Short mmCIF file of C-alpha atoms in Angstrom, two decimals:
data_model
loop_
_atom_site.label_atom_id
_atom_site.label_comp_id
_atom_site.label_asym_id
_atom_site.label_seq_id
_atom_site.Cartn_x
_atom_site.Cartn_y
_atom_site.Cartn_z
CA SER Q 1 0.00 0.00 0.00
CA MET Q 2 3.09 2.20 -0.13
CA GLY Q 3 2.34 2.76 -3.81
CA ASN Q 4 -1.31 3.45 -3.00
CA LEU Q 5 -0.47 6.03 -0.32
CA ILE Q 6 1.72 7.78 -2.90
CA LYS Q 7 -1.18 7.80 -5.37
CA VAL Q 8 -3.41 9.17 -2.58
CA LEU Q 9 -1.38 12.15 -1.35
CA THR Q 10 0.05 13.01 -4.79
CA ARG Q 11 -3.41 12.88 -6.39
CA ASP Q 12 -4.75 15.76 -8.51
CA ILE Q 13 -1.99 18.19 -7.53
CA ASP Q 14 -0.30 18.26 -10.92
CA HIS Q 15 -3.37 19.86 -12.65
CA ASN Q 16 -3.51 21.92 -9.38
CA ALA Q 17 -1.22 24.93 -8.75
CA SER Q 18 -0.82 27.19 -5.70
CA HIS Q 19 -4.36 26.35 -4.52
CA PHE Q 20 -4.49 24.98 -0.98
CA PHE Q 21 -8.21 24.20 -0.76
CA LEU Q 22 -9.41 20.87 -2.12
CA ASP Q 23 -12.18 20.56 -4.68
CA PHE Q 24 -15.13 18.80 -3.04
CA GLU Q 25 -16.04 16.76 -6.12
CA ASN Q 26 -12.42 15.76 -6.76
CA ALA Q 27 -11.40 14.91 -3.19
CA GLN Q 28 -14.71 13.07 -2.64
CA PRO Q 29 -14.68 12.80 1.17
CA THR Q 30 -16.62 10.12 2.99
CA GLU Q 31 -19.71 10.84 5.08
CA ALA Q 32 -17.57 10.83 8.24
CA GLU Q 33 -15.19 13.44 6.77
CA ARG Q 34 -17.82 15.99 5.71
CA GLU Q 35 -18.11 18.05 8.91
CA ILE Q 36 -14.33 18.50 9.18
CA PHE Q 37 -13.51 18.72 5.47
CA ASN Q 38 -15.93 21.65 5.18
CA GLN Q 39 -14.41 23.50 8.14
CA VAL Q 40 -10.79 22.95 7.11
CA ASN Q 41 -11.56 23.85 3.49
CA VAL Q 42 -12.75 27.32 4.56
CA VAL Q 43 -9.40 27.98 6.22
CA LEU Q 44 -7.58 26.60 3.18
CA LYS Q 45 -9.59 28.88 0.88
CA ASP Q 46 -8.13 31.87 2.75
CA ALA Q 47 -4.58 30.45 2.81
CA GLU Q 48 -4.03 31.50 -0.81
CA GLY Q 49 -5.12 35.03 0.03
CA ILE Q 50 -2.80 35.17 3.04
CA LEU Q 51 0.09 33.90 0.92
CA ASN Q 52 -0.57 36.46 -1.82
CA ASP Q 53 -0.59 39.31 0.71
CA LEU Q 54 2.83 38.14 1.90
CA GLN Q 55 4.14 38.14 -1.68
CA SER Q 56 2.91 41.74 -2.03
CA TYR Q 57 4.49 42.85 1.28
CA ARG Q 58 6.83 45.57 0.01
CA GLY Q 59 7.73 46.95 3.44
CA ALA Q 60 8.24 50.52 4.64
CA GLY Q 61 12.03 50.54 4.99
CA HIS Q 62 12.45 53.59 2.76
CA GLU Q 63 10.01 55.77 4.72
CA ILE Q 64 11.28 54.50 8.08
CA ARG Q 65 14.92 55.34 7.34
CA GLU Q 66 14.01 58.82 6.10
CA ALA Q 67 11.91 59.51 9.19
CA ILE Q 68 14.70 58.35 11.51
CA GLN Q 69 17.16 60.47 9.51
CA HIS Q 70 15.06 63.66 9.93
CA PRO Q 71 13.25 63.03 13.23
CA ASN Q 72 12.02 66.63 13.60
CA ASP Q 73 10.23 66.63 10.22
CA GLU Q 74 6.65 65.73 11.14
CA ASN Q 75 5.74 65.28 7.47
CA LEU Q 76 8.32 62.49 7.24
CA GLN Q 77 7.16 60.97 10.53
CA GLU Q 78 3.56 60.79 9.30
CA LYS Q 79 4.63 59.57 5.86
CA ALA Q 80 6.40 56.61 7.46
CA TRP Q 81 3.41 56.08 9.77
CA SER Q 82 0.96 56.16 6.86
CA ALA Q 83 3.08 53.52 5.10
CA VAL Q 84 3.79 51.14 8.00
CA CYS Q 85 0.23 51.04 9.39
CA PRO Q 86 -1.41 49.12 6.49
CA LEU Q 87 1.59 46.77 6.57
CA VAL Q 88 1.17 46.06 10.29
CA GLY Q 89 -2.46 45.46 9.39
CA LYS Q 90 -1.27 42.68 7.09
CA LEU Q 91 1.01 41.34 9.83
CA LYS Q 92 -2.01 41.36 12.14
CA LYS Q 93 -4.05 39.36 9.63
CA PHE Q 94 -1.21 36.85 9.17
CA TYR Q 95 -0.89 36.20 12.91
CA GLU Q 96 -4.66 35.89 13.31
CA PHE Q 97 -4.73 33.39 10.44
CA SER Q 98 -2.16 31.34 12.36
CA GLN Q 99 -4.80 30.92 15.08
CA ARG Q 100 -7.21 29.51 12.49
CA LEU Q 101 -4.58 26.98 11.38
CA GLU Q 102 -4.46 25.63 14.96
CA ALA Q 103 -8.22 25.03 14.96
CA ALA Q 104 -8.22 23.26 11.59
CA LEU Q 105 -5.27 21.11 12.71
CA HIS Q 106 -7.10 19.70 15.74
CA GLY Q 107 -10.03 18.74 13.52
CA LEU Q 108 -7.70 16.81 11.22
CA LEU Q 109 -5.64 15.25 14.01
CA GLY Q 110 -8.80 14.29 15.90
CA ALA Q 111 -9.98 12.25 12.91
CA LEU Q 112 -6.69 10.98 11.47
CA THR Q 113 -5.51 9.64 14.86
CA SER Q 114 -8.48 7.59 16.05
CA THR Q 115 -7.95 4.76 18.52
CA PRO Q 116 -8.70 1.58 16.48
CA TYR Q 117 -7.14 2.20 13.08
CA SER Q 118 -3.53 2.32 12.15
CA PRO Q 119 -1.81 5.32 10.51
CA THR Q 120 -1.63 3.57 7.13
CA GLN Q 121 -5.35 2.77 7.26
CA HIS Q 122 -6.22 6.30 8.43
CA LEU Q 123 -4.56 7.91 5.43
CA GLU Q 124 -6.42 5.42 3.18
CA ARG Q 125 -9.81 5.63 5.02
CA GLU Q 126 -9.84 9.45 5.49
CA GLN Q 127 -8.15 10.31 2.21
CA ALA Q 128 -9.65 13.79 1.92
CA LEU Q 129 -8.62 14.76 5.46
CA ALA Q 130 -5.12 13.41 4.83
CA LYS Q 131 -4.83 15.68 1.75
CA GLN Q 132 -5.98 18.69 3.82
CA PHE Q 133 -3.33 17.97 6.45
CA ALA Q 134 -0.65 17.99 3.74
CA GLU Q 135 -2.09 21.20 2.30
CA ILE Q 136 -1.95 22.87 5.72
CA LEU Q 137 1.74 21.97 5.90
CA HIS Q 138 2.18 23.08 2.28
CA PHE Q 139 0.99 26.60 3.09
CA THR Q 140 2.86 26.56 6.40
CA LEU Q 141 6.26 25.98 4.80
CA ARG Q 142 5.55 28.23 1.81
CA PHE Q 143 4.58 31.10 4.12
CA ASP Q 144 7.64 30.70 6.36
CA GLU Q 145 9.97 30.54 3.33
CA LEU Q 146 8.84 34.00 2.22
CA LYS Q 147 9.09 35.38 5.77
CA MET Q 148 12.72 34.26 5.98
CA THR Q 149 13.60 36.17 2.79
CA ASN Q 150 11.72 39.36 3.83
CA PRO Q 151 13.68 41.16 6.58
CA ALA Q 152 11.33 44.17 6.37
CA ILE Q 153 8.65 42.26 8.31
CA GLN Q 154 10.43 42.46 11.66
CA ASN Q 155 11.80 45.95 10.95
CA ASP Q 156 8.34 47.32 10.11
CA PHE Q 157 6.77 45.90 13.28
CA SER Q 158 9.65 46.91 15.57
CA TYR Q 159 9.47 50.49 14.28
CA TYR Q 160 5.70 50.34 14.78
CA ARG Q 161 6.01 49.39 18.46
CA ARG Q 162 8.64 52.09 19.06
CA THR Q 163 6.69 54.82 17.27
CA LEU Q 164 3.32 53.82 18.75
CA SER Q 165 4.31 53.81 22.39
CA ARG Q 166 6.10 57.22 22.17
CA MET Q 167 3.40 58.74 19.85
CA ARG Q 168 0.65 58.08 22.46
CA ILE Q 169 2.77 60.25 24.86
CA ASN Q 170 3.93 63.17 22.67
CA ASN Q 171 0.95 62.85 20.22
CA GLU Q 177 -9.78 51.10 16.24
CA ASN Q 178 -7.72 48.85 13.91
CA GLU Q 179 -4.76 49.75 16.16
CA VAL Q 180 -2.79 46.98 17.89
CA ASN Q 181 -2.60 46.73 21.63
CA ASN Q 182 0.53 46.00 23.66
CA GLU Q 183 -0.77 42.58 24.73
CA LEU Q 184 -1.35 41.49 21.13
CA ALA Q 185 1.91 43.11 19.99
CA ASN Q 186 3.93 40.95 22.39
CA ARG Q 187 2.41 37.78 20.92
CA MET Q 188 3.02 39.10 17.40
CA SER Q 189 6.64 39.91 18.28
CA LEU Q 190 7.25 36.37 19.55
CA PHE Q 191 5.51 35.16 16.38
CA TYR Q 192 7.69 37.04 13.89
CA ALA Q 193 10.87 36.42 15.89
CA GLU Q 194 10.58 32.75 14.89
CA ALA Q 195 12.50 31.55 11.85
CA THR Q 196 9.38 29.60 10.79
CA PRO Q 197 6.39 31.38 12.38
CA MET Q 198 3.59 29.23 10.93
CA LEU Q 199 5.50 26.00 11.53
CA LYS Q 200 6.35 26.87 15.14
CA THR Q 201 2.67 27.63 15.71
CA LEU Q 202 1.61 24.39 14.02
CA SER Q 203 4.24 22.56 16.07
CA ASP Q 204 2.75 23.84 19.33
CA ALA Q 205 -0.77 22.99 18.13
CA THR Q 206 0.28 19.38 17.53
CA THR Q 207 1.80 19.24 21.02
CA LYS Q 208 -1.48 20.65 22.37
CA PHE Q 209 -3.44 17.88 20.63
CA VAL Q 210 -1.41 15.18 22.39
CA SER Q 211 -2.02 16.86 25.76
CA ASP Q 212 -5.75 17.35 25.12
CA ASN Q 213 -6.14 13.62 24.33
CA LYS Q 214 -4.41 11.96 27.28
CA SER Q 215 -6.41 8.76 26.71
CA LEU Q 216 -5.07 8.62 23.13
CA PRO Q 217 -1.78 6.78 22.56
CA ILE Q 218 1.03 8.99 21.30
CA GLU Q 219 1.98 6.78 18.35
CA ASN Q 220 -1.48 7.33 16.84
CA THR Q 221 -0.22 10.88 16.26
CA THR Q 222 3.54 10.42 15.82
CA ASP Q 223 3.38 7.41 13.49
CA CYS Q 224 0.86 9.36 11.41
CA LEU Q 225 3.49 12.05 10.87
CA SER Q 226 6.27 9.52 10.21
CA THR Q 227 4.10 7.63 7.72
CA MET Q 228 3.51 10.87 5.80
CA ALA Q 229 7.25 11.56 5.93
CA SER Q 230 8.06 8.13 4.50
CA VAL Q 231 5.42 8.47 1.77
CA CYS Q 232 7.02 11.72 0.62
CA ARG Q 233 10.59 10.43 1.03
CA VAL Q 234 10.00 7.21 -0.93
CA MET Q 235 8.23 9.12 -3.70
CA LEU Q 236 11.12 11.59 -4.04
CA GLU Q 237 14.05 9.18 -3.63
CA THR Q 238 12.95 6.35 -5.95
CA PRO Q 239 13.32 7.00 -9.70
CA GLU Q 240 10.78 4.28 -10.54
CA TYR Q 241 8.22 6.37 -8.61
CA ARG Q 242 9.74 9.68 -9.74
CA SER Q 243 9.04 9.02 -13.42
CA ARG Q 244 5.49 7.96 -12.47
CA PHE Q 245 4.37 10.69 -10.06
CA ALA Q 246 7.10 13.26 -9.34
CA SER Q 247 6.60 16.43 -11.38
CA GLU Q 248 7.49 20.08 -10.78
CA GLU Q 249 4.53 20.87 -8.53
CA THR Q 250 4.42 17.39 -6.98
CA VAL Q 251 8.07 17.48 -5.86
CA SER Q 252 7.80 20.99 -4.42
CA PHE Q 253 4.60 19.94 -2.65
CA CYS Q 254 6.11 16.76 -1.16
CA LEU Q 255 9.34 18.44 -0.19
CA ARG Q 256 7.39 20.83 2.04
CA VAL Q 257 4.99 18.22 3.41
CA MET Q 258 8.00 16.10 4.39
CA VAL Q 259 9.84 18.89 6.21
CA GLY Q 260 6.60 19.88 7.94
CA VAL Q 261 5.83 16.46 9.42
CA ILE Q 262 9.50 15.93 10.36
CA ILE Q 263 9.55 19.04 12.55
CA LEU Q 264 6.14 18.18 14.02
CA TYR Q 265 7.46 14.69 14.77
CA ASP Q 266 10.61 16.06 16.41
CA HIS Q 267 8.56 18.19 18.81
CA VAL Q 268 5.87 15.63 19.62
CA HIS Q 269 7.93 12.42 19.74
CA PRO Q 270 9.71 12.31 23.12
CA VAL Q 271 13.22 11.37 21.90
CA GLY Q 272 12.82 13.40 18.72
CA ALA Q 273 13.25 12.58 15.05
CA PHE Q 274 17.00 11.84 15.27
CA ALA Q 275 17.19 9.20 18.01
CA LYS Q 276 17.62 5.52 17.20
CA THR Q 277 13.94 4.87 18.00
CA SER Q 278 12.73 7.55 15.57
CA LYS Q 279 10.65 6.29 12.65
CA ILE Q 280 11.79 8.99 10.20
CA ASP Q 281 14.73 8.28 7.90
CA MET Q 282 16.57 11.51 8.69
CA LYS Q 283 19.56 10.83 6.42
CA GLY Q 284 17.24 9.93 3.55
CA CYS Q 285 15.07 13.01 4.04
CA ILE Q 286 18.08 15.35 4.23
CA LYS Q 287 19.58 13.66 1.16
CA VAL Q 288 16.43 14.26 -0.89
CA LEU Q 289 16.66 17.96 -0.02
CA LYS Q 290 20.34 17.91 -1.02
CA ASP Q 291 19.72 16.34 -4.44
CA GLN Q 292 17.31 19.20 -5.21
CA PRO Q 293 18.56 22.50 -6.68
CA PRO Q 294 20.05 24.46 -3.78
CA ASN Q 295 18.19 27.76 -4.15
CA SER Q 296 14.68 26.25 -4.16
CA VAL Q 297 15.16 24.31 -0.89
CA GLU Q 298 17.33 26.63 1.21
CA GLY Q 299 14.26 27.74 3.15
CA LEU Q 300 13.44 24.14 4.02
CA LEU Q 301 17.02 23.39 5.10
CA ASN Q 302 16.95 26.46 7.36
CA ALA Q 303 13.75 25.13 8.94
CA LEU Q 304 15.50 21.81 9.77
CA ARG Q 305 18.42 23.76 11.29
CA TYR Q 306 16.52 26.28 13.46
CA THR Q 307 12.95 25.16 14.24
CA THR Q 308 14.26 21.76 15.35
CA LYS Q 309 14.15 20.71 18.96
CA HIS Q 310 16.51 17.69 19.06
CA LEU Q 311 19.03 18.54 16.32
CA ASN Q 312 21.76 19.80 18.67
CA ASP Q 313 21.36 16.96 21.18
CA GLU Q 314 24.45 15.00 22.14
CA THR Q 315 22.57 11.78 21.36
CA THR Q 316 22.00 13.08 17.79
CA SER Q 317 24.39 11.75 15.05
CA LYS Q 318 27.28 13.72 13.52
CA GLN Q 319 26.50 12.47 10.01
CA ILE Q 320 23.25 14.38 9.75
CA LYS Q 321 24.72 17.17 11.88
CA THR Q 322 27.44 17.47 9.23
CA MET Q 323 24.89 16.72 6.48
CA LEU Q 324 23.04 19.99 7.27
CA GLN Q 325 26.28 22.01 7.37
#
């Protein structure tokens, strides 16, 4: 069923491009998937809009530097303020969309990690919900890759917090200090959406104490092995791996790996891990370097157990 699971996750994504929501007629969920598929699909419909706003994030570095250069010129102070406020509005909408990702993740984890079935049978039984989980990770990695290449995001928000505080001394859709602190910890992360999704998966394990942990962890490791085997085998590469399919699976694999490393007690690098770390890193290495550097940075920074003394030197040196 390893070939079937590949045909399930990599199904109808070639003719698909940049769309994170699943077509209802194409995915064809079962009766037991309808109430969750509908909820998750609404969040996935907005994921494309969130990602497009991040691509259009030009930043206010030019106006900020000019205002700081001439701090007595009120026209330049208001020109920078008029430019950075709609951008902080976008940053506000991105962080609030991260909270919606946590809700849609618990609906998927709640169904894909039931007590009786195995991970392999869950991805085959609840095929539509398994596709949505991969699409949530797809957007998560694609969002965090843009954030890493856009240094104006943290500079715009830091200048906002400095100017706000001291403007409401000297001088509705405004941001409060309580929300700003959570946004600052959000954008200080190398992978903001993935860190959030990582905590949400840890929350799911704690909310379901009566649920065994491998029902969640082996679901992530199965998805990692489905993507790894598809990408590393040429027999399966000439059958399924295309431009959009490889880029999709590369990001689904890195997503579940980091989730696994935070939820699985010993991590994804220990001897008892079920993720082929060397094989997953190698697949990233055989890819063109520029298109995967964001994913490699995720495996080097968002990881919990990478720098452990129990962790191997081969992968440690593999990620150098």
